[PDB]
Amino acid sequence: TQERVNNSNKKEWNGMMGELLSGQADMIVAPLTINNERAQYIEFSKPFKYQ
Amino acid sequence: TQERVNNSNKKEWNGMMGELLSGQADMIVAPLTINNERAQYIEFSKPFKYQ
Amino acid sequence: SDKSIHLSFLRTVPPYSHQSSVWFEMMRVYSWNHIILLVSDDHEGRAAQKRLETLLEERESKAEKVLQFDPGTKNVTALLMEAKELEARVIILSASEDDAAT
Amino acid sequence: SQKCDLVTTGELFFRSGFGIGMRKDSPWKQNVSLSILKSHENGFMEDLDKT
Amino acid sequence: FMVNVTWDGKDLSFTEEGYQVHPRLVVIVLNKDREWEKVGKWENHTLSLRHAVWPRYKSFSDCEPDDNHLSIVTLEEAPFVIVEDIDPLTETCVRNTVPCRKFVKINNSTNEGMNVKKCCKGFCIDILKKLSRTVKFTYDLYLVTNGKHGKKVNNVWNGMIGEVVYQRAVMAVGSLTINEERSEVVDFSVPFVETGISVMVS
Amino acid sequence: VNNVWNGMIGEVVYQRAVMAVGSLTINEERSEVVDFSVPFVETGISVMVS
Amino acid sequence: MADKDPTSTFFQFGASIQQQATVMLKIMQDYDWHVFSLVTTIFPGYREFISFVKTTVDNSFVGWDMQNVITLDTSFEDAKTQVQLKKIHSSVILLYCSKDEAVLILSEARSLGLTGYDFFWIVPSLVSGNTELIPKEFPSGLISVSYDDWDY
Amino acid sequence: FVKTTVDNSFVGWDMQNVITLDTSFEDAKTQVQLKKIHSSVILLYCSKDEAVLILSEARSLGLTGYDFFWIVPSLVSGNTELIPKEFPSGLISVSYDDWDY
Amino acid sequence: DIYFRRQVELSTMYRHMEKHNYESAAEAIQAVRDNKLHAFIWDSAVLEFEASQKCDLVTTGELFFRSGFGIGMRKDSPWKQNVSLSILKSHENGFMEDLDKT
């Protein structure tokens, strides 16, 4: 999720998404969900489930 | 309830509202539920019933 | 080139922003859309990188990676090792003299 | 209420009371509204409703 | 030796370029006599203005008269208009509440207090917002602390209505109720909520 | 039919009309020929016997 | 000045083009104006202003609705400037010019009718002269963060 | 006639500012009057030379483009063989039938 | 939390959940079955499977914010088109339903 960096004023991607926005990245597969903020930076695929 | 004249695109009234507006009557004391199309040009009063 | 600090100037020689523009033009029709570049940390390198980046936006693309090294340095092995693990063999090194030799 | 063979089921919508209508320029407007409000407050209307 | 230098209490230091870390910026406006005023002062990290609300300056010597901005009076009561406290973090008024301001009074001879900002939401506020969108007029909503809905005492109206009586507020949205004596002084609009005098017993 | 489309898909692929709003179902051949966007209504194949 | 030789010890007491931006942002936030626009001419330093305003408005959560970031740069009377200026419909306008261009733009806007009782230009420092050469075009009620000369 | 026949219509028109360039293009009131036209349909009515002058002035004010539909009466589009340069390509002007009949 | 902050009307009812959220997915479930919490909002699949398996709790309510899952990518990688086509083919082939069955 988006969050403000401690002892600062900027914001960065924490959690599992931060790894995707870093060297590890590649082909993250997990019970992810589609949202506007998530789709703004990275791009998803066709859904493989509905919930 | 207002309507259009025969084959002419010019609105005109009828019934009680038409009789009052066409300089025939002077007061319309009767059940005359307040609306918006009516109140455009007839000065209503404070209601004496609530239905 | 900045009119703010040199409000009285003119010349008949292209700057190295034109060099970056020609880089883009020559790369454009060659099927080499994996551009990465090396920039010296000074005013010239910043201007070259900005010009290349603003020219690349006219194609809805982006640079694969961007790297910088201290001007007049002597140990650049780490930076080069950081540039190896990628799939872009199109290096656009734009250093200055002795830095280029190193 | 009188011929209780039918029923009055369902809720009520488009709440708007009745009123006494007259032309836009008439010297009876404010006085008529004041009289209606005064009667409504002092309870003459409730007697009519009961009767 | 100049990046982290402090002297004589008023700490001032430089960083990287010639940007003084703590500047002394001020704000100026064009007065009606064509001179620069001295509103606000960016001292340390807060703007610290001097005008609570914008004084609505006149554009030119041949501009149209101001006939849209107006003052609206309401008080807090019921689930019609409720006043909350300003959020400490993100010092703005949430998302949907309008910025109403109330006159705050302390106690004793020190009761003279500034116009604190305590913005409010409710049911009548929704109608006010819809009316503002439809008729296209901007307001200066402000709460009232002088009394109650209104009672003619000593041949002078006090509370809400009195304001509208004495040309101090062109509108009195809120939880008023129509009456006979009340309607003689001011002119009401068509009712939008039915009411009366009911009785409740536990 | 005969390597030529017709209908909603036919107009879009022949540079005759941008967008194909309506009741169009994402499939395999269609996505190979004409690219879609994010789905907004869930649907599939369902039998109906009462 | 913006850039300096890396062998110098010359320092000033003014304020950079980045600090005035946050000053006007605070001014806009305090009075609850929010929606605004960013008409700017072409002048050395405009791209930095636009980028800084974009970054500041992005990395914050107050609900600023910035739209119609105009960059009028071709003449001041032809069709392009007219239509682009007409596109504006906000209640706060934040411009960035250099005196003469600013007075020309303000005159054009008044002729179009954008300087009534419900508009507040917030042009920064650059268009403030020496605070003693006011042209007969600046509308009364024009915010411009500047330096202090009365204070001390 | 336009004002009277627009008040009796059920289609809900959107009557907007009406202008009257009384001056002979003095460039003081005509320009400011013409500048504030935010609509998309204009129902100009003038003489042929005055129409040419007005359209020439309007072309330089960014008021005629891909979506700006002018409508003109018959007395402007007169002899249909002396079309000047200033007339935009595409403008509806009802006239009389001199081709057939 | 993104959904709740997006909806301002829900943001009014956000504080109670804001100051009482947990830090995992199964610990809050253990607390719920330990008679410490009685509420939950998660993905449909996880809660439904948990209710079906643990024959102690049930899911009551109507599905809302019906947003499907999806495999992730970065920026614009060459793998996107082929992966999406393969996922669609698996959906139309009956493979996904069979895998969900097992």
Description:
Chain E: L-glutamate binds at residues 175, 177, 182. Chain E: Disulfide bonds join 93-119, 100-120. Chain E: It is found in: Cell projection, Dendritic spine; Cell membrane; Synapse; Postsynaptic cell membrane. Chain E: This is Glutamate receptor ionotropic, NMDA 2A. The structure is cut from a larger assembly and holds three copies of chain A, two copies of chain B (51 residues) and four copies of chain E. With 51 residues, chain A is of the alpha+beta class. Chain A has helices at residues 15-20, 36-41; strands spanning 2-4, 11-13. Chain A is globular, with a radius of gyration of 13 Å. Chain B is of the alpha+beta class and 51 residues long. The longest helix of chain B has 7 residues, at 15-21. Chain B has a two-stranded antiparallel sheet with strand order 1-2. Chain E has three helices and eleven strands, in the order E-E-E-E-E-E-E-E-H-E-E-E-H-H. By secondary structure, chain E is α+β, with helices and mostly antiparallel strands. The interface between E and G is large, with 41 and 47 residues.
Helix/strand/pairing class of chain A, anyone? alpha+beta
Global morphology of chain A: globular
What's the arrangement of strands in the largest beta sheet of chain E?
A: 1-2
By oligomeric state, this entry counts as part of a larger assembly
Taken as a percent bin, the fraction of beta residues of chain E is 5-15%
Please give the number of β-strands of chain E. 11
Interface with most residues? E-G, 41 and 47 residues
| Secondary structure: number of strands of chain A | 2
The radius of gyration over CA of chain E amounts to 23 Å
> How are helices and strands ordered from N to C of chain A?
EEHH
Euclidean distance between termini CA atoms of chain A: 20 Å
PDB class: membrane protein/immune system
Keywords: Channel, receptor, antibody, MEMBRANE PROTEIN-IMMUNE SYSTEM complex
Entry title: Human GluN1-2A with IgG 003-102 WT conformation
Chains A, C, I: Glutamate receptor ionotropic, NMDA 1
